[PDB]
Every structure is written in C-alpha cells, then in structure tokens.
Structure 1
Amino acid sequence: QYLLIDNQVSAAIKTTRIAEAIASIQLYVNRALENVEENANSGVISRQFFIDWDKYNKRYSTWAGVSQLVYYPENYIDPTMRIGQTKMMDALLQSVSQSQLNADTVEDAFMSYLTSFEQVANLKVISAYHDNINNDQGLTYFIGLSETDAGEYYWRSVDHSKFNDGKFAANAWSEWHKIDCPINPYKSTIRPVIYKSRLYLLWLEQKEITKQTGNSKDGYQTETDYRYELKLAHIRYDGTWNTPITFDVNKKISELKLEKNRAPGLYCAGYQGEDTLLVMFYNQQDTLDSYKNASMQGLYIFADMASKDMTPEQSNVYRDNSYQQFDTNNVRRVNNRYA
C-alpha cells in the first residue's frame, strides 16, 4: 500500500511500465479519496477531476470513453437525450406528445413554455454562496426573489466546472426552484449555505413584540421591541423545504450596534468539514479595509441543532482569514467555504 505496487504477485502476470504507473497512481488516489490516508489536501480533493472519479476518471476505459465523448460530442449529442433538460421542456414534450406532431402543435406548446419562463425570467438575485474554496470550481447557489412578492423565493445554482473562456456553458445553470417555506426575512438578509451536503437557508427576521401596557396603568408601548431570530431550514429529498430551526442572536446583534434601518451583515459559510457552520455578524462597512481589526460576533452551529458562541479569539481568526468575502456598502459578495 505504501509503495503502491504489489510485491506478492506471481511472475505469470504481464504488464507495461505505463500500465503500472496507471495503477500505482489509481491506488494513491483511491486511498486519499476514501480517507485511508488521514490528511489529504482538501483543496485538491474538491477538484472536479476527483468529483468525477467514481463515474469516469477512475478507469481507463471510462476515461477514454468520456474523453472521446467530449472531444467529438457531435457524434453523440441528441435533443432527446441530454443533460440538463428543463422542467419546461418536459412540459413541451408532454403537450406535444398528446397529438400529431406538426407546426400547430408546437406553437401551442411554446406559448405555455414561454409563459412558464416569463414568470422566473427576471427574479432579483438577492444573495449567493459558493460551495468550494476555490472560485473556479464547484457550485454557486443563488437565492432570487419575485418582483411580485416578499415570499416567492427561488434557488438556482451554477456549475463552475463548465466555466472556461470568460463564459459558462448554457447547461451550467440550473433552473429556478421554488421555495415553499414562508420566509419573511428582515432587509433581505437571507443567505444560502451548503451544509451537511444539503442546501440550507438562513436568515434573520424580526419578531415584533413588546409589552402591551405602558406603565402598567394608563399607557401603552409604542410598537415593538425587535427580537432577532435566526432561522435555519433545508431541502428535503422530496424537493420541499422543512420547518426552520430558530436561534437567539439578540445579544450579538445589539453588541454590534446598528442604526434603525440596518441589518447586520450575515456572514455565513460552512467549515469545509465536520458539518460545522460558521455564522458571523458584522456592522457592514463602506470598504473591506474596515474589517481589518474589526469587532465581529458569531456562533458555531453543529449538525446537532445546537450552537456555541465563538470566542473573540477565534472570531478574529475567521475574520482575518475570510475577509474580502464580507459585504460592504454598494456591493454584495458571494461567500464560499472555509477551510
């Protein structure tokens, strides 16, 4: 296992120098991927080459097949058999398939296709997260919002392995996926995160609550005190969303005192491993230089839906290592994983 070559094989077996090289290395990769070897470089393991290891790259025969498939794709591609067919294409096909195929049949199918498209053709993109640690690989998840509601959130993702000469392949993008969770975030603070290899949303919302009575006699409270609740929810394999988990983040938000019309910046990224989520709050600045030596609050959320406060000694580390991911006024940044 160490030398990646078998010293117990009979002499009856024939090989070539290249063939053994493509064996010792295959073992090397498998031991690293299976975590037999304790500390592989996570920034290498995450590369797309390894992501595809179990489908194509681990074998010569499948590697060669794919390499030809994508070198001369014109010999294999087909409108009826392709990757990324949209749900709206399914709608066209189901309508077309009900009758004779001709121009009129497709015209009606297209009108349905296009109206379905229009509804999500221009959502406002609110926020996003990259699930890799390198910006050239992995996926960016986005949250968008219909101009017609405060609800109607949709998620979308893009595959960066399909990004090359300044542009993305058309099927690098997913469709918009409706979120059925009744999310009512404060100041559009919501940010997606990939955690436990699932898509989670987290956001702050204010719970408007106060004492109904003023001085406990003749008098009243004005409107509300604002309790900041951090909600966390995820996608089920049903495609639907579950009920959010609520966390108390009020002391953190008050320490980082903001004005009345502000939301704390919500920094969130997954720790590369251990199903540990890093949540930080900050008083959003005009420039990234203001985060240098800034005071930040935060908490760790574990797979067991429980949390611990970050001690400032550590929150300062994440602050220093992860800045330039923090939002400032007039920009929005896509966060990424922390390794």
Structure 2
Amino acid sequence: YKSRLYLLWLEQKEITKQYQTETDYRYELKLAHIRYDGTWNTPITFDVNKKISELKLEKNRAPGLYCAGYQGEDTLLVMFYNQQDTLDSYKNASMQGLYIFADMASKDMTPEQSNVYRDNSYQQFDTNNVRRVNNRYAEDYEIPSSVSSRKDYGWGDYYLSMVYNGDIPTINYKAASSDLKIYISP
C-alpha cells in the first residue's frame, strides 16, 4: 500500500454468552505496517466480526481473505470471501468488505461496490486443495489520474526562452473491447 509493506491477519477470542452458558467466538481483523527504520509499527485493530458472522458460519472454518491496493484510488481494498467450495467460479456470492484509507480511518464497502471488485478479482483466492495469491487490483488498464514531472526538457533556440514545468492536471480513460479512448487536459 503506497509503496510500503503492510500485513493484515485475523484473531479469534473465546467469549461466553450469558440463562445459557455457551462457548462463542468473536473475530477481529488487525493491521500493521513497517516503519522506515525497519521496526514494525503498532498493530491497529478493526472489528469486522459483524461482517464475519453473516458469511456462512460452518463452525471451525477460516474465511477466505483478500488484500490489495487500488492504484487510482487512495484506499486499500480488503474483502472476505465466503466459504469457498471445492470448485471455483462462484460469482454472485455475497462478499462483505471494507475500504481502509491512508489515514487509519475505515469505511464499510457497500455490497454493490463489493460486487465490482468481486467481478474483477475472483479466482485470485480459492478453497481447500489450493492456496492462492492476490495480485494488485485493476479493472482494465492501469493509468494515472494525473502527471506532474518533466520526463524530458529542451531549451530554447537562443537560450532566451523556455517551457517551465507545467503539468497534466487531469487524465481520464474509457475502455472498449479492443478499443481505448484516453482523455487529457494539458
């Protein structure tokens, strides 16, 4: 995320429920990142237990998990796969995920938005008999929102004149099948 290594992991705590005494489990997601010096920062903790209960329990199992960074967007994408059955291609399955910003602030990923990333990044993690690795998430093409650095420059003919750094404030793009239109506002 933002060129720094982060890791996310999930811890389960035994909690008893009140006239009935029952073993119950609470799950919490935890985040950490590595500082410049090489020392790992404080683990910051998010409660995603609410989102976990809703995925089919199947007691004594571990939710499939997805971590990635989105290039164009500030946010980091975290998702919870449902139980993933032995076969793959299980689209349309409900995913409950979470948007985590740079600021440690976090916003809940809506199921509709969840389906977007679900659609572009499935098959990246799968069930028993295989373990799987997440690539960085991109919809079609990966391209900058903006460009502001002189990759090259040439001086005027007589050294009296020049073109000083001016930037490309906005870049947008639209994907078509085998066709691409890309828009610039120099």
Q: Fold match, TM over 0.5?
A: yes
- The residue type paired with residue 293 of structure 1 is N
Aligned-residue offset at 1:326: 2.0
- Unpaired runs of at least 5, structure 2: 139-186
From 297, 301, 311, the equivalent of 2:100 is 301
Aligned-residue offset at 1:324: 1.5
Cα distance in 2 between the residues matched to 1:243 and 1:206 = 19
Aligned-residue offset at 1:285: 2.1
SS of residue paired to 1:326: coil
Aligned-residue offset at 1:258: 2.4
Aligned-residue offset at 1:252: 1.0
Cα distance in 2 between the residues matched to 1:313 and 1:268 = 18
Calculate the aligned-residue CA RMSD, in Å.
Answer: 1.6
1:238 to 2:37 alignment = yes
From 294, 301, 319, the equivalent of 2:118 is 319
Aligned-residue offset at 1:329: 2.0
Cα distance in 1 between the residues matched to 2:106 and 2:117 = 17
Aligned-residue offset at 1:261: 1.6
Partner of 2:2: 196
SS of residue paired to 1:333: coil
Contact 2:78 2:97 in 1 (8 A): yes
Cα distance in 2 between the residues matched to 1:246 and 1:305 = 10
Q: As a proportion of its length, which structure holds more strand?
A: 2
Partner of 1:179: none
User: Across the two proteins, how many residue pairs are aligned to each other?
Assistant: 137
Aligned in 2, Cα 1:277/1:260: closer, same or farther, shift over 3 Å?
same
Aligned-residue offset at 1:255: 0.8
Partner of 1:278: 77
Contact 2:8 2:31 in 1 (8 A): yes
Equivalent runs, 1:73-88 vs 2, <5 Å: none
Partner of 1:186: none
Moved more, 308-317 or 268-277: 268-277
1:335 to 2:134 alignment = yes
From 82, 85, 88, the equivalent of 1:288 is 88
Higher relative contact order (CA 8 A, sep 6+): 2
SS of residue paired to 1:288: coil
Partner of 2:16: 210
- The residue type paired with residue 333 of structure 1 is R
- The residue type paired with residue 221 of structure 1 is T
Cα distance in 2 between the residues matched to 1:285 and 1:269 = 22
Equivalent runs, 1:214-229 vs 2, <5 Å: 214-215=18-19, 221-223=21-23, 225-229=24-28
Cα distance in 2 between the residues matched to 1:305 and 1:207 = 23
SS of residue paired to 1:294: coil
Contact 2:89 2:122 in 1 (8 A): no
Contact 2:35 2:41 in 1 (8 A): yes
Q: As a proportion of its length, which structure holds more helix?
A: 1
Q: Which has the larger radius of gyration?
A: 1
SS of residue paired to 1:275: coil
Partner of 1:122: none
Cα distance in 2 between the residues matched to 1:258 and 1:222 = 16
TM-score normalised by length of structure 2 = 0.68
Aligned-residue offset at 1:338: 1.0
Aligned-residue offset at 1:337: 0.8
Cα distance in 2 between the residues matched to 1:285 and 1:307 = 29
